[PDB]
Structure formats: C-alpha cells, structure tokens
Amino acid sequence: PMPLNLPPKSSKNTMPLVIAYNNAPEDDKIQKLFYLQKINYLLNKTQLNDDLFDWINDAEEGGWLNELAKFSINPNASFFLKGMQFAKAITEEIEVNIYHLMQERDQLLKEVEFEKCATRYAEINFLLNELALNDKKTKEIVERQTEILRLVAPKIKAIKGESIDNLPVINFNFKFTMSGWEAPFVFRVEDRHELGKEQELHSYGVSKYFIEDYSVFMMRFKAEDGSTVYKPVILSQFANQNNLEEIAKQLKDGSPKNIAPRIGYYFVQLTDFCLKLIETHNYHPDIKLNNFLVHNNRVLVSDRKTFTTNDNPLASEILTSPLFAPDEFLKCLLFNKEGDPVGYNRNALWKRMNMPQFMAYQLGMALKQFLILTQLDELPDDFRNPDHSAVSHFKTPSRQIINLSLLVQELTRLDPDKRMTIKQFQTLLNFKNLPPDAFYQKVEEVFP
Incomplete structure (x- = not known):
C-alpha cells in the first residue's frame, strides 16, 4: 500500500508525524488514525504556503486527502464534527464530560507520541463515539452537521x-x-x-x-x-434570531410575572459564558445585550471576532461600545463635537484595562439595560449615571427587581477594583427571591 507523501521541505513541521504514520503497521489502524489526527491538529495551527497547500489537497494515492478518505474523515468538517468522525473510525477498529474528553485528546495530539498513550487515546475516542450514539444532543449535532456538510x-x-x-x-x-x-x-x-x-x-x-x-x-x-x-x-x-435587547423589549408587553424569572434564566447563561471564556484566558470586550441571541432557549454570542487573549490590553487594543464602556475606557478617548469618540488621547498609549473587571461592568450594564427596557420604550438619557438606578424606573417594583437592581449597582462601581466580580454575581444571582434586606445580608457575606 502506497505510503503518505512526505510534506514539502518548505513546510516540514509535520515530517515526524508523517514518518510515524508511515512506520505504523498497516493493520494497526488506530495508530494510523492517531498520527492522522496529530497531523491535522498541527496543520490547523500552521501558516500555509503554496507547497503545503498543494500537499493537504492531494487526493491521489499517497496524498493527504486519500489517507483521510480511507477513514471517512471529511477535510472540510468543523472542529467538532471532524473529531467525531475520527472517534467513529477509531471505535470501529477496537456520565462523562465531552469537553474534558476533547481537551484530554487534544493534549495528546499536541505533545504526546502514540507509545505513551495508545490505550487512553482509544478510550477517549470510544467515549466520544458513545456520546455520538446515546446522548440525544450530541447525536442531533452530528446528524445535522453531516446533513449540512453533504448538501453544501x-x-x-x-x-x-x-x-x-x-x-x-x-x-x-x-x-x-x-x-x-x-x-x-x-x-x-x-x-x-x-x-x-x-x-x-x-x-x-x-x-x-x-x-x-x-x-x-x-x-x-x-x-x-x-x-x-x-x-x-x-x-x-445566518443568525436571524432575536438578540437579548429585542427580547427585553418583548418582555415589556408581556405578563410582568415572567420578567424576573426570564432575566435570571438568560443571565445565569450569560454569567456562565463570561466565566467559561475567562477560564480559557479569553475576554469579550464588547459585552452588550444585542451581541447575544437566543436559539432554542440558549444564549449564543453573536460573533467571536472581538475576543482577546490579553487580560490587560491598552485602550487602543480592544473594540468596544462606548455607550456600555466603563469610565476607565472612556477617559482614554477623544470626543467629537456631536459627542462621538473620534479617537485616542495620550492616555491610550499606556493606560490598561483589567478585563475581568471590564466584563463585570459591561455584564452589569447589560442587566441595567435589560431591566430598563422592560419598563420604558427607550433607554433614558442618563442611563450610564449610577445615581439613576434600575429600580428608579419601576413603579411598585418587584422584590426580584429590587435585588437585581442592587446587583447592577455593585457591578458598575466607578472604581474597577471595587466592582463585584462575575463569579460573585453568579452566586448571588441564585438568591434573587430572598426579601430585600435579606438579599442585602447575603450580598455583604459574598462581597464584603
């Protein structure tokens, strides 16, 4: 059986993986699949050139695409689906968290040779294929994504x-x-x-x-x-679903009994997004209601173009929305005659933002905007001002609206180092029912 052509000398980072793939015994399919998946992992983090681009698009015998076709792996599949096609091909040759599994496999693909992890590698891929077979959500994602990939x-x-x-x-x-x-x-x-x-x-x-x-x-x-x-x-x-700003406006003309429970449902999800993005050392500098949609009762971020890995960037290194921007960011901007940020002043060259406190403010301003759009048609002129709180705009406000309004104030303090953290906001979100003064006691306990 013809071996896999060696990568071009101009781009030979995959050379050891190709040699390992070719030296694996022909009937050792799992080792074949492992070095196939290692090549793909390294290709995904490689800047291409004309010669390497030709190499990954060779479908003749000995070409990269012909090796993939042997195992029904689609070179155009998404990161999730391609991994699952790998998991099925490996399983054919033989209660759990799918993201832990994917992370464990990726660490092996990143740095480990087949010698030191052959059985655990197959174990992971078996568990991944099991989710594709028995978990209703994973099965639906694989079936739908295979359908779309074929028809497109x-x-x-x-x-x-x-x-x-x-x-x-x-x-x-x-x-x-x-x-x-x-x-x-x-x-x-x-x-x-x-x-x-x-x-x-x-x-x-x-x-x-x-x-x-x-x-x-x-x-x-x-x-x-x-x-x-x-x-x-x-x-x-194309994401044509309603964003959270449109949803808040919908909740004004609905039953007021749904307002407080719907806010908690959406903001439990928004908080978990924020913390889980920080767990990967990534930060969203443009947190606002209309940058999140709801699709089958799930909050989705509108795009990830603005994500940053830097937790302390300069003002000129993040794209944000000035209406929802904290004052430490606004003090770095130069403003128009109309009042529009036109550019930067000298501060922006050295003044830095603490991203987790930046996101805490903007998450708190999204809660403020959500609360107000439930009562008023448009946002007030002084919506940024922490004097004009959220309960301010309510007439006979609910107990939940009182506690949520308080969380807004604690997330948007002028001093970044005095702000409440998203982690604390998560814990105290689950106590929005307790009576006002009792909620104030829990707030002091969680955030002294």
Whole structure:
C-alpha cells in the first residue's frame, strides 16, 4: 500500500508525524488514525504556503486527502464534527464530560507520541463515539452537521474553485440560500492567519455558547501587499434570531410575572459564558445585550471576532461600545463635537484595562439595560449615571427587581477594583427571591 507523501521541505513541521504514520503497521489502524489526527491538529495551527497547500489537497494515492478518505474523515468538517468522525473510525477498529474528553485528546495530539498513550487515546475516542450514539444532543449535532456538510458540498467546491480575482482582498462574507432552509447560510473569512485559537476554543465548554460552524477550510486570497495569502473560511447559518435587547423589549408587553424569572434564566447563561471564556484566558470586550441571541432557549454570542487573549490590553487594543464602556475606557478617548469618540488621547498609549473587571461592568450594564427596557420604550438619557438606578424606573417594583437592581449597582462601581466580580454575581444571582434586606445580608457575606 502506497505510503503518505512526505510534506514539502518548505513546510516540514509535520515530517515526524508523517514518518510515524508511515512506520505504523498497516493493520494497526488506530495508530494510523492517531498520527492522522496529530497531523491535522498541527496543520490547523500552521501558516500555509503554496507547497503545503498543494500537499493537504492531494487526493491521489499517497496524498493527504486519500489517507483521510480511507477513514471517512471529511477535510472540510468543523472542529467538532471532524473529531467525531475520527472517534467513529477509531471505535470501529477496537456520565462523562465531552469537553474534558476533547481537551484530554487534544493534549495528546499536541505533545504526546502514540507509545505513551495508545490505550487512553482509544478510550477517549470510544467515549466520544458513545456520546455520538446515546446522548440525544450530541447525536442531533452530528446528524445535522453531516446533513449540512453533504448538501453544501457543491457550494464549497464552487467557492474553492472561484477565481482569486473574484474574491475579496486582504468582515468578509458570502451569503447563499438553500431551498428548505429559512435562514441563509454564510461563508466568512477570519482575521487570524491560522486556526490555532479556534481549534482550542472548541475543546472548551464555552463553545456551547458559540454559533454553530458547519465547515472549515483554508483558501488562497490576494493580499493587500500584492502577495497571495491563505485564510480560514468558515460556514454557518445566518443568525436571524432575536438578540437579548429585542427580547427585553418583548418582555415589556408581556405578563410582568415572567420578567424576573426570564432575566435570571438568560443571565445565569450569560454569567456562565463570561466565566467559561475567562477560564480559557479569553475576554469579550464588547459585552452588550444585542451581541447575544437566543436559539432554542440558549444564549449564543453573536460573533467571536472581538475576543482577546490579553487580560490587560491598552485602550487602543480592544473594540468596544462606548455607550456600555466603563469610565476607565472612556477617559482614554477623544470626543467629537456631536459627542462621538473620534479617537485616542495620550492616555491610550499606556493606560490598561483589567478585563475581568471590564466584563463585570459591561455584564452589569447589560442587566441595567435589560431591566430598563422592560419598563420604558427607550433607554433614558442618563442611563450610564449610577445615581439613576434600575429600580428608579419601576413603579411598585418587584422584590426580584429590587435585588437585581442592587446587583447592577455593585457591578458598575466607578472604581474597577471595587466592582463585584462575575463569579460573585453568579452566586448571588441564585438568591434573587430572598426579601430585600435579606438579599442585602447575603450580598455583604459574598462581597464584603
């Protein structure tokens, strides 16, 4: 059986993995699959060149794509689905947390050779395939994503074969509708040169708040410097669901008995997103109601283009929304005659933001905006001012609205180091029913 062609000498980081794949015994399919998955893992965090791009697109015998086809692994599958296709092929040759499993497998693919982990590797992939077979949610995701990947395959082929001059030069995206699907589908180009960060994110539990991506592949584009560059192209369904700002406005014209329980439901999820993103050393600098949607009673972040890995960035290194921005960020901006931030002043070159206290403020301002849109048609002119609290706008306010309004004030204190943390907000969210003074006692206990 013809071996796998060695990677090009111009880009030979996968050389040891290819040699290990070829030296594995032909009937040792699990070791074949393990080094196939290691190559893919390293390819996903590799900047491509013309010679390596040719190598990953060789479907002739001895080519990378022919090795994948032997195990029904789709080179255009999403990070989640491609891992699951690996888990089924490995299982054929043989109560748990899927994100722990994916993280454990990724650590092996990152740094470990097959010698030191062969049986645990197959154990992980068996458990992953078990979830694909018995967990209703995982089974639905695999079935739906296999359906979409098959039916969009002509579109993937067409865009991959499109002339490079008909593509954009380096928020680029391509929209198309499919008969039978209401929401259109979108191909988008990412800003990063590789998928290393995307590959890691989908092994973390914060990806359950991500809009589902269906296909990932690299493509050649003309760059702004005249050269040709390779960028990731990711497919998803256009997100036409209501955002949280639209939902708050819906709750004003509904029964007031649903307001307090619906806020807790959405903000339990929003808080868990914030903390789980911080667990991966990532930060969302543009936290606001209209950047989150609800899809089948799940909160999803609208996009991840603004995520940052830096917990102490300069003002000029994060994109945010000034209306919901803390004062430490506003003091770094230069303003218009209309009152619009026009640019930066000298402060922005050295003044830094503490991201977890930045997110605490913006999460608290999203709660303030959610509470107010439940009572008023539009936000008041002085909505930023902590004098004008949220209960302020209520007439005969509920006990829950009193406790939630207090949490808003504790999350938006002018001094970042005096703000409540999202972790504390999570704990005290589960006590919004207790009477006002009793809620004040619990607040003092959790946040002295």
